[PDB]
Structure formats: structure tokens, C-alpha cells
DNA sequence: GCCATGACTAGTA
DNA sequence: TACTAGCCATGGC
């Protein structure tokens, strides 16, 4: 298993897979590390997704063409699928999900299974929101949700949105 | 509005109301008694009834209510009202029986402020996993009731499980 | 408007008012700071109120003698007269002081006006609580809060929970 | 338009 | 058991 951090307006994101498919994308200081277990540096590793999401930030890009290993319990992939539903720039709530995947009621068991996203960005928790419509949390700092909310509707330097 | 204190297997109950039709039913130790006047030979109908009850042999009440209270207040009172003597729902099973949907905590909260003890059923309502969550007059005495509605006999007993 | 600083076992605190009556008493980057309008420094002021504290602190001091002049709403006053009823070494859920003040419902209200106690300790926002068990929110954040709680449990100082 | 609430409910370690 | 990035109705402010 290959990993590879890079910069960005939000601080490090560091990758991680298998050849060229995702199992892990993760943030400096977000909760819920998993165990890195036979992981290993390498530069050169997943140049597709690297150019994605630095076009991503550059206001570029909306959709994420990329390979992905999701691995996880049922009820938390049935959600982080439904995840991928959310386009770019639209928002939907926490109990929304709850609804759209056949689970009424479970309006805050996708509180845990959007912490446990185990591929940031490109599987968008931070799209997933209160019924009110406040973010009430984030992996990453509620900030960073908030910056990347603020690229998705104004074109806006996250670089900026994240010192307010 | 008058009012008069009673027994019953869990300790004194206080009704109060004006005329024959009442307004509030307080167990002890529960969760504002302004211009309240105390008269002994009140609301005997209803007292008769709430002695019926505790013998098992009252199933049905037939009293005048007064319930005074939020929109949402009295539409869940409303539907606990709907509730048989010896069956029970979820807050869950309310919230969705009056068209509002996930709000079963609120129901907790709008059963909290039951004016009306008893009569109105509000005691019957349980968590989803069966578990008693909580009571006005505390969870001893829930327990009590619904074992008395159960066996239709005294469960004055129950009381110390 | 006198006012003197003196030290604690959870930092240092603030003693303010007139002449020999208690109007303030305050912790450090506590929540909703009062203007310190023609407050004038007076580093002898208060001595009774303060070998009180120092006894409280060593778990000696159970009951505080204290001439206390509030301010606050009509509601404010009657959420903090509740709160001297509340006996050194037990609590009360929010909602069981908003029953004891004739107005249930108004469990969430009763939050706020703990926020706003001007008088910290000798008036015990401190011994107030969710019904869950679980301490809420407090001024000088919950480290201090839990830390008097262990205090009047222990009758022994409980300066180290700061850090638990 | 803010919240230091609370008789809920749903999945994991 | 007991954890939560939730929820909805509140009553002051």
C-alpha cells in the first residue's frame, strides 16, 4: 500500500491506495486516523487524482473522475455511495440521506458514517449538513468544511474563506 | 379554580379545574398553583373513577378535560388519548401518528408537560427498545401503572421492584 | 466600583463591587465579559469574601457569608436565587431549577442565565447540570467546572482535574 | 436570531 | 454498555 501527501490551500492531503485506486484520503489533524499498516512513500503515486484536485482548488474542476476501494460496513457504504449522488456545489442535509438510502430516521447514525468518510473531497462529507442548514461538524476543522463550501458556490480562494 | 387532594396506591393526587371540568391531575414530587382554592367535595365523578382505576376495574374514563397548551402540546396529548388501557407506544410510533416525523424527542417533552396525569395515558408511552426512559412522578411509579394495566389488579406492589 | 485579583487553584479571580457588597466575581477568558466601567483597583478590598475563598478551595469552607447586590432580568434573578438554594456538594439538573421557579420549559432558557451569573462560585452556576448526567457548558470551560464538582465531592482540593 | 436543554433514536467498539 | 458531525419544540433574549 503506496502513499503520497501533497499541498494544498488547505494544508497537506495525504493519499493513499492500491497501484492507482484510492483507499485513503485524510487531512493533517482530522479525527479518526486509521492505522497506516504497511504503508509506503511514493512520490510518483496517483499523478491522475493529483492533478484533479489541484484543479479542484484552482476552481477548475467539479466532478472527480477516479478509482476508488471503499471499505466499510453496509450501512456506512449504502451512505458514503449516496454521498457521490450530491452534485458539485449543492448541499444536502444529514436527514436527507437518512431518507434517500432507506434508512428514516437515522438522521444521526450518518453523523458517525460522514466521520468515518475514509476519502475526503472526492467523496464529499463535507456536502452533508444540519436540517437548519449549520455545519455541525467535520472530520478536519468546521472551518475547512466551511472554505470548501465557499469554493463550491463563489469560485472563492479557500486560502481566504478558512481565516474568517 | 378549585382543587382537592386525594389518595391512591402512589401517594396523594391533587385535581384542580373549575366547575366539574379539570384542567390539571398532579402526583407527588412532580414535574404554580396561583388562585387555587381548596374544596373537598369536587370532581367526585372523576375521583370515583381514579379509585376504580387503581382497584383494575376502570379501563375507560368519562370526565370533562381542559387542556391548555401549545399547538403541538395538544396534538400529542390528543393521541396519547387514543392509546388502549394496557398498550403502549414509542415516542416514535406518537410522533409519526400526528403527521410529525422524526420529532419523537419533542414528544418527550410535550409528554413531559402533561398537565393531566394518568387520565391521560401519558405514562404508556416507552422507548422503541421498550426501555421506560423517564416519568413525572419518576420511573418507579410508571413501572407501577403499566404493571397494574397489565394484570387489571393491584400492583401497589410494584412500587419497590 | 472597587474590584481586586487574587489567586486561585483554577486561575486567578476577580472581585468586584462596592465598598464591602459583591456585584462581580470572575475567572479568566470566561464566557461574556462585562465592561470594567470606573472600576478602580483596590488590593485590600474584599478580605472577608477572600479568606472564604481560600477556605473553600482547601475544602474547608462549605457555606459562604456574603453581602451580594445582583443585577440581571426579572427571570435572571429568579434563576440565580434559585441557584443559593443548591447545597455544597449536590446538583440539579436545568430544567429541575426551572420547576423550582414555576416555569417548566424553560430548561434551555435556564442555560442562559447561568451564562450570565456575575457571581461565579459563591453563586453556584457551577453546581447545575444536564439531566443526562452530563455538565453542559461552563464560563472558564468545563476543566474548571468539572474541578469545583470534585472539590465539594472530595471535600479535598481537586486541583489536578483541571488536567484529567 | 441567538442558546451551558431534554421522558429519542440509530448504529459500532 | 455507552459512545456521537442529529433532530425538533421550546422559552428567554
Redesign the interface.
Request: aromatic share 8%; hydrophobic share 35%; proline share 6%.
Given at each position: 500500500v503506496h502513499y503520497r501527501t501533497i499541498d494544498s490551500p488547505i494544508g497537506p492531503l495525504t493519499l493513499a491506495g492500491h497501484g492507482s485506486v484510492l483507499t485513503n484520503l485524510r487531512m493533517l489533524e482530522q479525527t479518526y486516523e486509521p492505522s497506516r499498516t504497511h504503508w509506503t512513500p511514493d512520490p510518483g503515486a496517483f499523478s491522475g487524482a493529483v492533478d484533479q484536485l489541484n484543479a479542484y482548488f484552482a476552481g477548475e474542476l467539479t466532478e472527480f473522475d477516479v478509482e476508488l476501494d471503499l471499505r466499510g460496513t453496509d450501512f456506512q457504504q449504502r451512505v458514503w455511495k449516496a454521498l457521490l449522488t450530491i452534485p458539485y456545489g449543492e448541499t444536502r442535509s444529514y436527514?436527507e440521506i437518512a431518507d434517500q438510502i432507506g434508512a428514516?430516521?437515522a438522521?444521526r447514525a450518518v453523523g458517525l458514517a460522514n466521520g468515518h468518510n475514509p476519502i475526503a473531497i472526492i467523496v464529499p462529507c463535507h456536502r452533508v449538513i444540519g436540517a437548519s442548514g449549520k455545519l455541525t461538524g467535520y472530520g478536519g476543522g468546521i472551518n475547512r468544511k466551511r472554505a470548501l463550501l465557499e469554493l463550491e458556490k463563489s469560485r472563492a480562494p479557500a486560502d481566504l474563506t478558512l481565516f474568517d
Amino acid at each position: 500500500v503506496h502513499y503520497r501527501t501533497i499541498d494544498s490551500p488547505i494544508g497537506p492531503l495525504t493519499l493513499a491506495g492500491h497501484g492507482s485506486v484510492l483507499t485513503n484520503l485524510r487531512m493533517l489533524e482530522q479525527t479518526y486516523e486509521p492505522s497506516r499498516t504497511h504503508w509506503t512513500p511514493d512520490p510518483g503515486a496517483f499523478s491522475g487524482a493529483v492533478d484533479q484536485l489541484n484543479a479542484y482548488f484552482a476552481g477548475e474542476l467539479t466532478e472527480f473522475d477516479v478509482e476508488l476501494d471503499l471499505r466499510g460496513t453496509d450501512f456506512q457504504q449504502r451512505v458514503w455511495k449516496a454521498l457521490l449522488t450530491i452534485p458539485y456545489g449543492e448541499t444536502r442535509s444529514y436527514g436527507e440521506i437518512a431518507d434517500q438510502i432507506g434508512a428514516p430516521g437515522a438522521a444521526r447514525a450518518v453523523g458517525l458514517a460522514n466521520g468515518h468518510n475514509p476519502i475526503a473531497i472526492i467523496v464529499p462529507c463535507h456536502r452533508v449538513i444540519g436540517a437548519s442548514g449549520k455545519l455541525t461538524g467535520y472530520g478536519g476543522g468546521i472551518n475547512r468544511k466551511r472554505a470548501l463550501l465557499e469554493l463550491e458556490k463563489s469560485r472563492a480562494p479557500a486560502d481566504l474563506t478558512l481565516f474568517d
